Amino acid sequence: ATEKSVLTLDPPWIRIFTGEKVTLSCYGNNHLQMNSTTKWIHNGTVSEVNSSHLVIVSATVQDSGKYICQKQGLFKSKPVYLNVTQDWLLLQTSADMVLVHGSFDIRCHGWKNWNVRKVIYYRNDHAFNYSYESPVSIREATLNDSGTYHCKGYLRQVKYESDKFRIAVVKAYKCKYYWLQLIFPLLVAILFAVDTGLLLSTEEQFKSVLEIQK
Amino acid sequence: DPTLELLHSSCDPNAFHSTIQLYCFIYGHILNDVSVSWLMDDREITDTLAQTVLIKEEGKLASTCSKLNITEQQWMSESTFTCKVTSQGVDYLAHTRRCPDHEPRGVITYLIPPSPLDLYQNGAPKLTCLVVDLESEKNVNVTWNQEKKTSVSASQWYTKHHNNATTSITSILPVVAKDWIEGYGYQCIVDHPDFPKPIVRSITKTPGQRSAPEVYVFPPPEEESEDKRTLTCLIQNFFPEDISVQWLGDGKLISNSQHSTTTPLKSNGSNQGFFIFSRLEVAKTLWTQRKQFTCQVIHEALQKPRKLEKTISTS
Amino acid sequence: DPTLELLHSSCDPNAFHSTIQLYCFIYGHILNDVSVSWLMDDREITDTLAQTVLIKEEGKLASTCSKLNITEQQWMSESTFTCKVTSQGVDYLAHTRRCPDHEPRGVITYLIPPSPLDLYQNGAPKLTCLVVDLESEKNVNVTWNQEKKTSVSASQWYTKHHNNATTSITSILPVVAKDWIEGYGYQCIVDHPDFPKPIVRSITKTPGQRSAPEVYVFPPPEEESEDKRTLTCLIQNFFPEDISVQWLGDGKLISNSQHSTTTPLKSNGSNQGFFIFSRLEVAKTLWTQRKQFTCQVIHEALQKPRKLEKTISTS
Amino acid sequence: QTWRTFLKKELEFLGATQILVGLICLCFGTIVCSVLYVSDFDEEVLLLYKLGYPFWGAVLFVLSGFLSIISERKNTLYLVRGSLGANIVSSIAAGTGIAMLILNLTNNFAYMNNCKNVTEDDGCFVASFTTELVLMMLFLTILAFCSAVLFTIYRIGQEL
Amino acid sequence: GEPQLCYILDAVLFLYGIVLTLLYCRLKIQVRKAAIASREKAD
Amino acid sequence: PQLCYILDAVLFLYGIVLTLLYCRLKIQVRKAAIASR
Numbered sequence A: 001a002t003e004k005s006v007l008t009l010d011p012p013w014i015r016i017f018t019g020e021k022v023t024l025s026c027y028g029n030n031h032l033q034m035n036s037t038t039k040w041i042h043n044g045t046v047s048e049v050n051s052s053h054l055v056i057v058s059a060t061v062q063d064s065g066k067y068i069c070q071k072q073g074l075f076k077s078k079p080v081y082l083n084v085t086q087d088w089l090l091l092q093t094s095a096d097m098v099l100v101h102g103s104f105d106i107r108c109h110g111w112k113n114w115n116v117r118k119v120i121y122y123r124n125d126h127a128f129n130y131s132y133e134s135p136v137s138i139r140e141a142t143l144n145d146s147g148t149y150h151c152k153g154y155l156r157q158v159k160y161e162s163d164k165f166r167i168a169v170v171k172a173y174k175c176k177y178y179w180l181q182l183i184f185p186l187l188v189a190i191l192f193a194v195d196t197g198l199l200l201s202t203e204e205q206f207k208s209v210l211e212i213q214k
Numbered sequence B, C: 001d002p003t004l005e006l007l008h009s010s011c012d013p014n015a016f017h018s019t020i021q022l023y024c025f026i027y028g029h030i031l032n033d034v035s036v037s038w039l040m041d042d043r044e045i046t047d048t049l050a051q052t053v054l055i056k057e058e059g060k061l062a063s064t065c066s067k068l069n070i071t072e073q074q075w076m077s078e079s080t081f082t083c084k085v086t087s088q089g090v091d092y093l094a095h096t097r098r099c100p101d102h103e104p105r106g107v108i109t110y111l112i113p114p115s116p117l118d119l120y121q122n123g124a125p126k127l128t129c130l131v132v133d134l135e136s137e138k139n140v141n142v143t144w145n146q147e148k149k150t151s152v153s154a155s156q157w158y159t160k161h162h163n164n165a166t167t168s169i170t171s172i173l174p175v176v177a178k179d180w181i182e183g184y185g186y187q188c189i190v191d192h193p194d195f196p197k198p199i200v201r202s203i204t205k206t207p208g209q210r211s212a213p214e215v216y217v218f219p220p221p222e223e224e225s226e227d228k229r230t231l232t233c234l235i236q237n238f239f240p241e242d243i244s245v246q247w248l249g250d251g252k253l254i255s256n257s258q259h260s261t262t263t264p265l266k267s268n269g270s271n272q273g274f275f276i277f278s279r280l281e282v283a284k285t286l287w288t289q290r291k292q293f294t295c296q297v298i299h300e301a302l303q304k305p306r307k308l309e310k311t312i313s314t315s
Numbered sequence D: 001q002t003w004r005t006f007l008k009k010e011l012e013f014l015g016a017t018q019i020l021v022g023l024i025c026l027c028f029g030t031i032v033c034s035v036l037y038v039s040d041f042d043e044e045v046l047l048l049y050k051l052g053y054p055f056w057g058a059v060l061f062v063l064s065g066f067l068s069i070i071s072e073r074k075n076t077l078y079l080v081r082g083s084l085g086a087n088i089v090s091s092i093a094a095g096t097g098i099a100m101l102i103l104n105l106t107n108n109f110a111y112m113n114n115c116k117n118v119t120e121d122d123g124c125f126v127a128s129f130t131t132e133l134v135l136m137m138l139f140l141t142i143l144a145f146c147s148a149v150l151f152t153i154y155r156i157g158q159e160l
Numbered sequence E: 001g002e003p004q005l006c007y008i009l010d011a012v013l014f015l016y017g018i019v020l021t022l023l024y025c026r027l028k029i030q031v032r033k034a035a036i037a038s039r040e041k042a043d
Numbered sequence F: 001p002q003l004c005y006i007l008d009a010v011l012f013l014y015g016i017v018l019t020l021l022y023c024r025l026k027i028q029v030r031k032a033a034i035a036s037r
């Protein structure tokens, strides 16, 4: 039976700087039988890449977007939202949406891998952790971790503040098409409204024939 | 052409002196002409500590040594020091720094609003955009943005190579005082094609209620002890802290070095007055010459010509 | 029994330097008796650069300069360079080391000298080690080294939190008042298991020449028909900058609410000292009450009990 | 006379049922093609919505039911054979639709077996939505196939 | 857990709605046939 | 969740009302047909 595919980033930071090299690896149990190529989708475009690992030596602004990988005989993998910017300081995160009791890694990075020291991480404009050089990877994430994060650090000896990024830590309600789950209810209502109109017409005609067949 | 060497001791942590010993040796200096002077990173020290003695005497070259005591904190601040020898009219520099374990401290930009003295009395307000720690002046874009487009502009641009293995680039923007008085922002943009995004600053007249300063000049509190007399000017209850204070002697302007203006300090009362003091020391001869002095404070909150003069006499 | 002087050269910013230089000066040792060697990490030197050149002639005594050069890697390792002299069967050695870098892991150490008010009048001084920018109170060792006079006094250490995810550690060491006047050393040593080396910070009374402060109190010039009264007290020609100010007007002490003190600043040459202004603001209800106003000052240069009082009467 | 006498109302009832089934099938086709036809989702999960089966089947059902309704009023005495042939080909259309429905059902079952956390992403949620749709369409197509087979056997009985 | 309940709820709602719609269509067909037969026979 | 629950409640009430009206109308039409026979 066909299996699902998974896409991994190297480095696993979904936010990278311009010109950085990133490897997207698509190994979703492709070894069911023989080696095979890959299908890569970026903004609904089938790029001419059919390798397990796609390498971007010099990432650009246009490289940002929605990435999907699919192995032959396997279904498409989970989409990855790559976000490339050109700021002095960036707050790289492992993922943008984290389930309850999950873990996600956050790290403050400088331009061209410059030395970054005395970093403070603010959640909802409130500092929660002061890290010298280590990441602030959070384990067992709960609903209180949802919000806007940004890291303020020192490039060389100059104070900089990274752009604010919203990370949503919620339950399994990933959602998107719940409005279609209004579909059965809506369809029955339309259907029930059609039935009500039919009932009105039927009773009017029944009364009319009652004066007719009396 | 005398040669210069410059050394220092390190810490000797086992004993308390809290001092590093800078030693500048000058070899071959012409006799009775050595004028070695000590210089910080463009922060020349006024402390009277030379201790210059002769090591050996030859007749025409000889040698000499100059000694400084420096606090451990200043030596730790990665500051550069230099002994300068002015011999036969030519200068010679010998530099020293606790050289880094890191990279040259990135890039720092400063924006200086025009001084009130030139803003309200001798009209020529100029904004200063000064960038330091630059490796070199190569394709350095220094542009400006004003809320109101008045053309003219014609901002200057000049770079100065410091001894601290670095250069500083300064630009002066000539503005008219009316826009600043009414309130208009200005931005300086510095762009080196190695930057993720241009660095932009913002200067604007500080928001808040304007308070008219009150200026009081005190009589000399000392007695007939000769030496020096002290004149005090207290300026209180003004907003913002942008203020200019100078002393006038019988209509003639006294130089900056004589008078000292204290740094602004937040007032305890519910007025945000930023009370300030200015002191002037006067020699006995000047006081006995029957001279008249004037405090000439300049502030924005005052009506035209925004000058408050308080007169103090001798008789 | 000669005199040792170890001096390591600079690491010049203006040019490129990779030959960091070491000089060992021996003064007063016996003529034609040189056995100087170099010792790194208690292991004999291997480089052939071991010149021993006679500096000059001192009769039966002599002066010898030992010259060595090394690279950055030999210095960046924080080694134990010494120059050993085997004179008359006695091994004289002096230790030189690359000074431990301040804030090795970004922690900023402030160690405040005791306030003159609590050290000269109250009689209960304290040394405050105020390390900030830490991460957790885990294995943070703050120790007090009482040089010369070890004593038996203990220390009180505690933690303090803010909102920056930065833990602060404050340690108070109660010392004896006489010892500060005598000038014995004191040191705070901070140790952390992420630190490569524990850091040491020491200070005592500022060395220099003691100058008796001069205090003058000014009458309120603020136009008595107005509401508020301002009191000015100028204290000048005091060294060092450590000085205490208080107001004991009409008996008891006025709390630190209607009071402010100007930051110390250096005088314009002449005498090596400082000047400060103290301003006291009161209302009409407190004023015109037939009370006294005294601007008491405490400084070490003063005679016992180190108190000078300038008093004015509202009468 | 069993079905020979029962058909006089059953023919109209099953024709109206065919019209209803066609209408909701067309509704599903339009809604899913407008909403659930993005390139991000895979093609195997939307087996029905790849060959044009919903629109074609809805058109065939609507046309056949309309012809049956018009013929039940005895219009020109000619539409009987046209309706018979239309529902005869609609029988094969419904069989093909059932085959496509079961293929999509087993594909969605495999996809849901691949899913572990029960709709942990967009793909599994839209797969559950698609299998829902498959179950409805299977019920509606069973109803339509019963209608078509009943109408065809009745019209064969008349045409002998 | 939570979505399957409303899932099955909507499925049974749709099934009941379809059954009721067929029932009402049958009622409409029967009443029209009766009305048209009565009108043709009486008039 | 709660939205489809309240829609389910109102739709069950609507279906019950429609079923009762359909039963009443079917009883009436059956009685009329029996009287016509």
Ligand SMILES: *[C@@H]1O[C@H](CO)[C@@H](O[C@@H]2O[C@H](CO)[C@@H](O[C@@H]3O[C@H](CO[C@H]4O[C@H](CO)[C@@H](O)[C@H](O)[C@@H]4O)[C@@H](O)[C@H](O[C@H]4O[C@H](CO)[C@@H](O)[C@H](O)[C@@H]4O)[C@@H]3O)[C@H](O)[C@H]2NC(C)=O)[C@H](O)[C@H]1NC(C)=O
Pocket (backbone or CB within 6 Å): B041, B042, B078, B104, B105, B108, B110, B112, B130, B132, B133, B162, B164, B166, B168
């Ligand atoms: C290499 O060596 C050069 C030698 O000049 C250094 O250049 C100096 O660097 C220092 C610090 O980097 C500069 O000091 C800063 O100056 C700013 C502007 O100065 C004007 O305005 C102030 C009033 O604000 C006047 O007093 C002054 O006379 C000038 O008119 C100040 O705004 C800065 O203060 C700000 O920061 C401090 C904290 O540092 C705050 O406490 C203040 O409140 C304020 O926010 C600061 O004082 C100095 O101006 C530079 N000189 C020149 C000529 O450019 C290089 O820095 C050095 N580089 C390295 C890597 O060592």
Ligand SMILES: *[C@@H]1O[C@H](CO)[C@@H](O[C@@H]2O[C@H](CO)[C@@H](O[C@@H]3O[C@H](CO[C@H]4O[C@H](CO)[C@@H](O)[C@H](O)[C@@H]4O)[C@@H](O)[C@H](O[C@H]4O[C@H](CO)[C@@H](O)[C@H](O)[C@@H]4O)[C@@H]3O)[C@H](O)[C@H]2NC(C)=O)[C@H](O)[C@H]1NC(C)=O
Pocket (backbone or CB within 6 Å): A118, A120, C108, C110, C112, C130, C132, C133, C162, C163, C164, C166, C168
């Ligand atoms: C998160 O927030 C905390 C607390 O707000 C910050 O910690 C502060 O850090 C600053 C900078 O390191 C500290 O400022 C320094 O305080 C020293 C101690 O002050 C004591 O003594 C003075 C009298 O001198 C008292 O008025 C005061 O109440 C204290 O009792 C000062 O001595 C320092 O001044 C010296 O250094 C400066 C240069 O930095 C010189 O210009 C001065 O002339 C002087 O030589 C300095 O002001 C501050 O004290 C800390 N707070 C506390 C409560 O201790 C964290 O830094 C912040 N997080 C980050 C990442 O920044």
Ligand SMILES: *[C@@H]1O[C@H](CO)[C@@H](O[C@@H]2O[C@H](CO)[C@@H](O[C@@H]3O[C@H](CO)[C@@H](O)[C@H](O)[C@@H]3O)[C@H](O)[C@H]2NC(C)=O)[C@H](O)[C@H]1NC(C)=O
Pocket (backbone or CB within 6 Å): A042, A043, A061, A062, A063, A064, A065, A066, A082, A083, A084
């Ligand atoms: C496919 O869609 C992605 C979005 O996920 C496109 O990337 C987005 O567009 C450009 C890259 O070409 C980036 O630059 C920005 O564009 C916006 C307009 O959308 C503009 O207002 C900004 O000033 C900036 O120029 C944009 O940041 C990027 N989106 C993200 C989130 O980074 C991608 O371009 C699309 N594919 C093609 C072929 O266009």
Ligand SMILES: *[C@@H]1O[C@H](CO)[C@@H](O[C@@H]2O[C@H](CO)[C@@H](O[C@@H]3O[C@H](CO)[C@@H](O)[C@H](O)[C@@H]3O)[C@H](O)[C@H]2NC(C)=O)[C@H](O)[C@H]1NC(C)=O
Pocket (backbone or CB within 6 Å): A081, A083, A084, A085, A163, A164, A165, A166
């Ligand atoms: C991808 O990265 C970009 C950064 O290039 C993100 O855009 C940033 O989004 C935040 C919102 O959290 C913006 O902050 C807001 O900006 C507005 C601007 O007026 C300001 O008014 C608000 O107070 C707030 O600060 C931020 O400006 C914006 N950055 C840029 C350059 O536009 C983006 O959210 C990331 N994700 C996606 C999916 O694109």
Ligand SMILES: *[C@@H]1O[C@H](CO)[C@@H](O)[C@H](O)[C@H]1NC(C)=O
Pocket (backbone or CB within 6 Å): A037, A050, A051, A052
């Ligand atoms: C992609 O396909 C082409 C043509 O089939 C082939 O030449 C190429 O080697 C493939 N890419 C990889 C990485 O195997």
Ligand SMILES: *[C@@H]1O[C@H](CO)[C@@H](O)[C@H](O)[C@H]1NC(C)=O
Pocket (backbone or CB within 6 Å): A128, A129, A130, A131, A134, A135, A136
């Ligand atoms: C901050 O980050 C560190 C990682 O060094 C982690 O151990 C800690 O739990 C985080 N949170 C706080 C409140 O320190």
Ligand SMILES: *[C@@H]1O[C@H](CO)[C@@H](O)[C@H](O)[C@H]1NC(C)=O
Pocket (backbone or CB within 6 Å): A143, A144
């Ligand atoms: C989440 O945060 C809110 C407000 O910040 C707080 O009231 C609530 O108690 C937090 N959650 C928990 C489980 O404590």
Ligand SMILES: *[C@@H]1O[C@H](CO)[C@@H](O)[C@H](O)[C@H]1NC(C)=O
Pocket (backbone or CB within 6 Å): B017, B019, B051, B067, B068, B069, C207
């Ligand atoms: C100043 O330097 C001289 C040089 O010999 C030294 O003797 C003296 O102890 C030093 N004083 C201080 C306070 O460092």
Ligand SMILES: *[C@@H]1O[C@H](CO)[C@@H](O)[C@H](O)[C@H]1NC(C)=O
Pocket (backbone or CB within 6 Å): B139, B140, B141, B142, B143
């Ligand atoms: C600097 O910026 C201005 C404005 O964009 C531009 O006209 C100029 O060519 C740039 N180059 C230099 C060297 O200043």
Ligand SMILES: *[C@@H]1O[C@H](CO)[C@@H](O)[C@H](O)[C@H]1NC(C)=O
Pocket (backbone or CB within 6 Å): C019, C020, C021, C049, C068, C069, C070
């Ligand atoms: C040792 O280093 C110094 C430092 O400049 C240099 O002048 C000297 O020539 C070096 N010695 C040798 C033998 O190269």
Ligand SMILES: *[C@@H]1O[C@H](CO)[C@@H](O)[C@H](O)[C@H]1NC(C)=O
Pocket (backbone or CB within 6 Å): C139, C140, C141, C191, C192, C193
């Ligand atoms: C000092 O040593 C270690 C430093 O990590 C610390 O754990 C210990 O508790 C300290 N002991 C004393 C007596 O200060």
